[PDB]
Amino acid sequence: NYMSNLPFGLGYGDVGKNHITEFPSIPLPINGPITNKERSLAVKYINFGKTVKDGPFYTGSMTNDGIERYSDKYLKKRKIGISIDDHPYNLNLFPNELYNVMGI
Amino acid sequence: LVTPEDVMTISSLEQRTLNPDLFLYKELVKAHLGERAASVIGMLVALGRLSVRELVEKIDGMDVDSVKTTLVSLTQLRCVKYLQETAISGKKTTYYYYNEEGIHILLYSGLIIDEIITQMRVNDEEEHKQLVAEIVQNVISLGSLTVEDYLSSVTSDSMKYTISSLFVQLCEMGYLIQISKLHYTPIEDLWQFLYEKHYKNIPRNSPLSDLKKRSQAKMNAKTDFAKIINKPNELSQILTVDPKTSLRIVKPTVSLTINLDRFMKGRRSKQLINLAKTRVGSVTAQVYKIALRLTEQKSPKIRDPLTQTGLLQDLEEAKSFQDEAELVEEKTPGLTFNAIDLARHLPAELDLRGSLLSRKPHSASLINSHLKILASSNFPFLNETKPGVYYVPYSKLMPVLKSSVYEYVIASTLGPSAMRLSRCIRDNKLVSEKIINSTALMKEKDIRSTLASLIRYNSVEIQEVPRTADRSASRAVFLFRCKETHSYNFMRQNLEWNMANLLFKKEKLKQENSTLLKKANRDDVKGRENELLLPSELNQLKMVNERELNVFARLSRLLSLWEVFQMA
Amino acid sequence: GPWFTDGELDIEFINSLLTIVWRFISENTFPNGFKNFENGPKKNVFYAPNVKNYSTTQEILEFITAAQVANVELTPSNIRSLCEVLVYDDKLEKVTHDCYRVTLESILQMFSIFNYFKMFPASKHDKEVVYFDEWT
């Protein structure tokens, strides 16, 4: 009846609960104590990527009121973003389809 | 009992179905560049070859200008390969691959700058270290950096003079190789362009037939591919020119791109030296630290000279590629060195005096003795073609190094009986249910429990033994196998997926701490984080910053695990 | 042989054999044994290449028989079986002519993946913890 099938080494208490661990657990040893070198590596990681995002290499972007407040008149501009076409590049590394976007 | 709503939110079950090659690369591009470029590179991974119109009709973004901008940003990041395929019967259009290794410059950025700081012979000076760090950070952030831009950028001419000085060194070392068409086209398409020309070059009515004309065509194609690949991989033609009454200069018009191959040679040397530091005591492990450093600069290719990825290896007489690889490894005379060659490069700190006990001052005899013990070591670190002059082989070191690293990873993963069983399954080819007992003599219960805990991965291969014509594994006992190739495969998916999980956790913490991180990364706020900040908000920023330092430390520790399994 | 006892493979008894065969080689291979690693990493000494630092099978047989620890006579085939058992678990390195050597044994007993007992888990309710079974 599918219930008499049991190996001799196996028990009856262990079966029937099932479920299993929500996430399999084996504590990895690559989480060891920090060093000064590793902290500085985290720091330089932080400066990098932030460097490219503060640069013009984002291409990810997808109070916008039609009336201009007198405060917004003669107010400091946010930032003149350096355009993708503005940055000088080498033509020979880039395709012909990609030439029309750069300011030649 | 755990709620289905509870899991897949804290359990990360939906991430477990993600392919690591797509998952990690998409996460890296999403974190660094942007969401649109991430979608582009992810779709390029999902479909290897596609045009711009394929992006337009397969992604939500359908605008032509916007996809142009994001694709040119990706190409400038050296993350995309292109080729212009020509249909003779009409208008031709270019396709687009993705650069697998180009994103490592993004990933290895912290490691790349760590080694650009650590490697240099002159690093004690604080200003020089900081400027070389800045220059490498700029070159990796911008892709191809040009001295035409940089020299005009710098304000002090003497500061400008050091800039042109560091570059010639950076190009000799190999950290800066002239970027060209070779870094944007697929290997097999290069091979097909080199393979079709020599088939069209043959005049008709030759006495030879197809077998030998194809032989000569593939031979000539291999020769010309080797030439076209060996010209720009190592070269100094940019820096050769020298103007009158002036120092040596590089070509300022050309673009300088930070390379990766010699950096990974350095990382591999670092991991071998770390192996030695674990393997042997520091008296001669400190010696070995530089023994590879005098051969790492011109060390040969690590996995494939790109003549194995662009073409089918071989069908009959297959050993040719391994034979020629080891042949070149033995032929290259520069890699071979003598003890006189190593005496000029040893630092003053090392003494090499109490290092040897022959029986139970930079002396060329004793370094030669370390070199003999290295070649006589059980692991083939060096080979001795002629008395005194040895060389580093890779025709037989790679399989054993891969076996050792994978096996000790499995050991760190499982229990001592489990590493013992794996060792038996490895050394003893084709073990069985009684051969395990004869070769182990351990407790069968725990042996089999660890065996079951080890079947889950691609660690040991099972077999079916049919006592009758019909194959039923239940009717008759079964044997085991080794099949190490699947094991070396597994250490790619699991580790790449784990790295992708770290990047996902970091980006998600950024997503839920966006406003705090924005108020953090502001110029006047920077260096003044303990004054214009609320108590609880300051505490929150502090603990999350420690948390991301922790995630970066774990990321860095994991980054010493996958480059080894990325070899051949 | 004696390893067969009561139909069970003698958890306690076989383990003490696996930790006595290697022990002799660990003081025999090094110039001073394991005390040469006690002064520190930077002060240990190593043998010259041409010296016969390797141990042969006859020497281990003589040692294990004069020690009288197993209370059982050992065939050379049985000692080869023992070394076949322990060639596993990263023990005596296999050299031609049945020669053995140990390199990081003191480091083990007392990222550099080959030694991880100096690196401890997170041991915290915190996050970002990695698991090798997470992918499956």
Curated annotation (Swiss-Prot), chain A:
DNA-dependent RNA polymerase catalyzes the transcription of DNA into RNA using the four ribonucleoside triphosphates as substrates. Specific peripheric component of RNA polymerase III which synthesizes small RNAs, such as 5S rRNA and tRNAs. C31 is involved in the formation of the initiation complex. Transmembrane segments: none annotated. The acidic domain is essential for its function. This is DNA-directed RNA polymerase III subunit RPC7. It is found in: Nucleus. Component of the RNA polymerase III (Pol III) complex consisting of 17 subunits. Belongs to the eukaryotic RPC7 RNA polymerase subunit family.
Swiss-Prot record, chain B:
Its main location: cytoplasm. GO terms for biological process: termination of RNA polymerase III transcription; transcription by RNA polymerase III; transcription initiation at RNA polymerase III promoter; tRNA transcription by RNA polymerase III. It holds the Pfam family RNA_pol_Rpc82. Keywords: Cytoplasm, DNA-directed RNA polymerase, Nucleus, Phosphoprotein, Transcription, Zinc. One of its GO terms (cellular component) is nucleoplasm. One of its GO terms (molecular function) is single-stranded DNA binding. It is found in: Cytoplasm; Nucleus. Gene3D superfamilies: Winged helix-like DNA-binding domain superfamily/Winged helix DNA-binding domain. Signal peptide: none annotated. The modification Phosphothreonine is found at T3. Residues 495-516 are annotated as: Leucine-zipper. DNA-dependent RNA polymerase catalyzes the transcription of DNA into RNA using the four ribonucleoside triphosphates as substrates. Specific core component of RNA polymerase III which synthesizes small RNAs, such as 5S rRNA and tRNAs. Belongs to the eukaryotic RPC3/POLR3C RNA polymerase subunit family. Component of the RNA polymerase III (Pol III) complex consisting of 17 subunits. Present with 2520 molecules/cell in log phase SD medium. This is DNA-directed RNA polymerase III subunit RPC3.
Swiss-Prot record, chain C:
It is found in: Nucleus. It comes from the Eukaryota. DNA-dependent RNA polymerase catalyzes the transcription of DNA into RNA using the four ribonucleoside triphosphates as substrates. Specific peripheric component of RNA polymerase III which synthesizes small RNAs, such as 5S rRNA and tRNAs. Involved in recruitment of Pol III to the preinitiation complex. Involved in the configuration of an initiation-competent form of RNA polymerase. Component of the RNA polymerase III (Pol III) complex consisting of 17 subunits. Interacts with BRF1/TDS4. Belongs to the eukaryotic RPC34/RPC39 RNA polymerase subunit family. This is DNA-directed RNA polymerase III subunit RPC6. The lineage of its organism: Eukaryota, Fungi, Dikarya, Ascomycota, Saccharomycotina. The chain holds residues 162 to 316 of 317 of the full protein.
